[PDB]
Amino acid sequence: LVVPNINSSNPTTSNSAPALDAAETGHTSSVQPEDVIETRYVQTSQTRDEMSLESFLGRSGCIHESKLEVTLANYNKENFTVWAINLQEMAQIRRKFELFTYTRFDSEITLVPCISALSQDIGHITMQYMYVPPGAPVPNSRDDYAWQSGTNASVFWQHGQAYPRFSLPFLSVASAYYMFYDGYDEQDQNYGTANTNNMGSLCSRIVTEKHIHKVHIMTRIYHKAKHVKAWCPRPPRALEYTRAHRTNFKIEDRSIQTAIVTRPIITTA
Amino acid sequence: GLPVFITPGSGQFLTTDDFQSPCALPWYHPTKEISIPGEVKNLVEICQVDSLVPINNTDTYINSENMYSVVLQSSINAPDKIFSIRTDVASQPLATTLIGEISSYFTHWTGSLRFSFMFCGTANTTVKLLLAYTPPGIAEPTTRKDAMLGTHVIWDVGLQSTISMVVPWISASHYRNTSPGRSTSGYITCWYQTRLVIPPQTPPTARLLCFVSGCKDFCLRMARDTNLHLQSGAIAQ
Amino acid sequence: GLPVFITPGSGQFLTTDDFQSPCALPWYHPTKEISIPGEVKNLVEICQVDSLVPINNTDTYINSENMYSVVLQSSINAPDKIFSIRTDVASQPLATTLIGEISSYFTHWTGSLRFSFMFCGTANTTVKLLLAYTPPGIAEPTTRKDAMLGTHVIWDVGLQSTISMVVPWISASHYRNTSPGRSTSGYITCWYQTRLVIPPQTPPTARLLCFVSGCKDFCLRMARDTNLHLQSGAIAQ
Amino acid sequence: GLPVFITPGSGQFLTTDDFQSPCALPWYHPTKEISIPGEVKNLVEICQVDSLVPINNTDT
């Protein structure tokens, strides 16, 4: 994708003022360097590929850090985690996608599981990550029958194994994901994207049977968009995020602080 | 089987990689695409849209709509400086504009910037202003004479309320860093060329709006995370 | 999938390997190349440029410009030896010349060496010198008779102040080690063929400069780290 | 990438194997071959040369 060349320009004395316009119209000016100055002929050679959406959004970033603290006391009763999937909990990723009103893409998920040794050894640890779409039974314990995964997709990782990874196709029941939603429940509740963005949960359990080593397992989840499309650009988020699915920005006993830096006097740059 | 040789790098997770991976929902057929107006394909499309520069970024006007306008005065009968700003796309106050925000997701930039001004006084109020761009290598101008020695436009505010001026790319290197250190691309300064004149019974001051966007010229490279946004804590579910 | 068989060597990091690896900055477009005079494509280009040999490497002239010249004397009326040096490219004093320095990044060498001399006395000063190369297998010559029995050039210093002599490759093996042990490629010795003669009122001594470079012949192989440079400690940031 | 399946034997070192391996001195050009009389190509050439049998192998 090529940037146009800067053409040669000469001294003009004319009735048409390309520099003069009306921005009241809501249209951006069309003035190029050649219209305002006696320009030199330069052969520009820049591709714009890296500025494409595929390039911009097609990078893996963290969207969730799942901590499983293995308890040896009630081994089968606990030792599992549940997380309602979404891209609203980590700022770097969230801000990039919210530059658009609607987005559509396939997802690549890469998992980075880290075992923290709290005993002399870690033994042999194996984890199971299961995707539970809305409506499927959510596991209630480490030994829940739902872990049989008769039809849900599960992925297994054992100590020593490379980072797991798999793709998910565009999941919505609509034609695009809603990055913003000016609407409600059928009950006039839950303003926002909580209504529209119900992708189910990601559940995990330590598969290895009762053992004697305390460990904590932190699995960070990375998401990368593939084959991306987006519509209706929006201004970038100017303040810290406080909640998922809400554009709220007020923090208790703290003033609104944007990234604009003030200066003493506007006649000094 | 086929004798193979494992290469360094194998098994690593590089967040900017590009490999295929098995699909967890085989045979799944996604919702058909429907027509939605407003598709964006490249970030440069956003960089090319004008947005207001918070030119009046002082503690007095800071969290309001006033940081976006400058007040001109009819009582001034002199070649005074009205305002100035560095030309670096991601420097303050340009940093939070659309183009400054997108530029902050990249490391290098190149191209020309289009600055537009809209005069918002009465239809009977007039003025001529000197808008000047000072190439780098020198201190920002403190007198109209020094400013006009550079690239400039003399704006006659009459029936058209807007004007566009282009800050051309004048740099040693083909690209510049979006985070400049002890560096500058220059300055834009505004001066009274004549005077703000008004008939009787007309407000004695008038505001000016300043917009910025990039030209066909404009280009950014080397994607990076922005310094214009933070996360100091968890985001509640 | 495709049955494969892992081969020994797999997973190792060999610093002189040549494999592809994923790019961490996908889609990045580097700055266009512009024309810069002076491109070098091969190290032999440097080996073929003359550089001064620090022929006078004694404790007296050592950290100065004097280590690079030899003084001839009009008071000597005899077939005396003026100086001598081993011919091994990376031996001292040749070691720190351009060709000696590049040779020290390799293990083997072959080819002919071109030695040039520049007479720097008065335009009215004259002399004839015997420049000789003694093939190996014998001690360096201590008399002009023994020196001239080898390869030599008789230089008449008149109107041209420079001369070039070539030390040909004469070796049993096709290549030699740049680090020689109890070995030599021979010697170059300089002798008075006649005498340094001067008219009245002219300085009674004159200097001589010696340069070395390789011929079309010259070649180096088996890259290695140089013994001519050290790091005994950290380099401060 | 290409789905592959690792086979038994993988990663082992068999001293009589025959695989390729990276060269530690890339681009290195060895000394040309010159003519040397007496080249041997096969051990049978040696087996076909007469040698004396130590037929009188007694302690004396």
């Binding site: 590929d49 494409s52 396939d106 593939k226 | 295929q20 699909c23 929902l25 085989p26 | - | -």
Partner: peptide, 25 residues
């Protein structure tokens, strides 16, 4: 198939398109 680059080899190994790598621009 083979593609040029800003020449390299590339084919899809899985049966679902979501599995494919980044899109060509």
């Amino acid at each position: 198939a083979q593609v040029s680059r800003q020449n390299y080899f590339n084919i899809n190994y899985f049966k679902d398109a979501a599995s494919n790598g980044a899109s060509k621009l």
